[PDB]
């Protein structure tokens, strides 16, 4: 099945990504607090709703939050400043707080139910966001031997997410706070940091056959743009 691409709002970042965030893939964006990772998540939750000539997939989004970073009014702002109805856009973002890592796993199973329900409608789910994906795993699996167990549980969670992406042709977008020898299993990893002039800088990590470069973007009333 053809890979779909969701624009980030930034032409620079989209170029680095080969046109946008891919369906049938997990894209991980990681960095310090304020690096742009959560602003990008909010922006994508709007962009996915647009038609493809505007960089979207005519879809809806599901946003799983682990550290209370979801801001409904930020979504409404991004929508309004892109010519969209804020309330309709917010209603197309299904939100859930994950209370712990086991609940986070159940929420992914519930996401599958919603994806199946909407799959053949005019607005399928096309984006699943997990913000600060590792935060509960890091607090719960800690101490001697926790590295192996945590990594096994994370790998299983990521395998479940990969299955949804591949089976239902959706993009999975995950964020993490930055922590250098641990394994990772996202399809594509993107490091974000602050740069000069209020800009954020993006770099692909461990993607040897994707072209060499860095993207530059801003955080604005439209979410993310150049
Ligand atoms: Cl951010």
Nearest to 101 by CA among 160, 168, 150, 28: 150
Neighbours of 88 (CB within 10 A): 10
Nearest to 175 by CA among 23, 9, 32, 5: 32
Burial 198-210, CB ≥16 within 10 A → b, else e:
ebbbbebeeeeee
Technique used by the depositors: X-ray
If you count them, how many residues does the chain have?
Answer: 226
CB of 46 within 8 A of CB of 222? no
Cα(145) to centroid(ligand 1), Å: 32
195 is in an annotated binding site: no
The angle, 0 to 180 degrees and rounded to 10, between the axes of the packed helices 37-47 and 72-81 is: 60
Query: For 1-226, which CATH superfamily applies?
Result: P-loop containing nucleotide triphosphate hydrolases (3.40.50.300)
The Cα–Cα gap between 7 and 19 comes to: 7
Contacts of 120 (CB under 8 A, 6+ apart): none
Cα(90) to centroid(ligand 1), Å: 19
The Cα–Cα gap between 70 and 174 comes to: 13
β-pairing verdict for 188-194 and 200-205: antiparallel
Nearest to 15 by CA among 134, 190, 156: 190
CA 65 to chain CA centroid, nearest Å: 11
CB of 129 within 8 A of CB of 45? yes
9 is in an annotated binding site: no
Q: Where are the alpha helices (DSSP H) in the chain?
A: 11-16, 37-47, 72-81, 86-91, 101-118, 135-140, 146-168
Radius of gyration of the chain (CA): 16
Q: Which two tokens stand for residue 86?
A: 């804020």
The Cα–Cα gap between 169 and 163 comes to: 10
The Cα–Cα gap between 57 and 108 comes to: 21
Cα(49) to centroid(ligand 1), Å: 21
Residue showing tokens 């604005």: 220
Neighbours of 86 (CB within 10 A): 18
32 is in an annotated binding site: yes
The Cα–Cα gap between 125 and 143 comes to: 38
CB of 57 within 8 A of CB of 68? no
Resolution of the structure, angstroms: 1.1
The Cα–Cα gap between 73 and 84 comes to: 14
217 is in an annotated binding site: no
37 is in an annotated binding site: yes
Q: Which two tokens stand for residue 188?
A: 């594509």
Neighbours of 147 (CB within 10 A): 13
Q: What are phi and psi for residue 220, nearest 5 degrees? A: -135, -175
CB of 48 within 8 A of CB of 56? yes
The Cα–Cα gap between 56 and 47 comes to: 5
Cα(57) to centroid(ligand 1), Å: 23
Neighbours of 182 (CB within 10 A): 10
Q: Which two tokens stand for residue 222?
A: 């439209």
């Amino acid at each position: 099945a053809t890979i779909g691409r969701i624009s980030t709002g930034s032409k620079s970042l989209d170029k680095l990504l080969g046109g946008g965030i891919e369906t049938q893939a997990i894209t991980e964006v990681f960095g310090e607090f304020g690096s742009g990772k959560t602003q990008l998540a909010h922006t994508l939750a709007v962009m996915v709703q647009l038609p493809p000539e505007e960089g979207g997939l005519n879809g809806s989004a599901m946003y799983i939050d682990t550290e209370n970073t979801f801001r409904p009014e930020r979504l409404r702002e991004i929508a309004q400043n892109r010519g969209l109805d804020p309330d309709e856009v917010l209603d197309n973002v299904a939100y859930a707080r994950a209370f712990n890592s086991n609940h986070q796993m159940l929420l992914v199973q519930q996401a599958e139910d919603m994806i199946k329900e909407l799959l053949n409608t005019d607005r399928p789910v096309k984006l699943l966001i997990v913000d600060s994906l590792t935060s509960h795993f890091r607090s719960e699996y800690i101490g001697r031997g926790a590295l192996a167990e945590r990594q096994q549980k994370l790998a299983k969670h990521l395998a479940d997410l990969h299955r949804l992406a591949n089976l239902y042709d959706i993009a999975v977008f995950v964020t993490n706070q930055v922590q250098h020898i641990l394994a990772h299993s996202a399809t594509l990893r993107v490091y974000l940091r602050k740069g000069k002039g209020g800009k954020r800088i993006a770099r692909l990590i461990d993607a040897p056959h994707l072209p060499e470069g860095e993207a530059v973007f801003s955080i604005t009333e439209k979410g993310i743009e150049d």
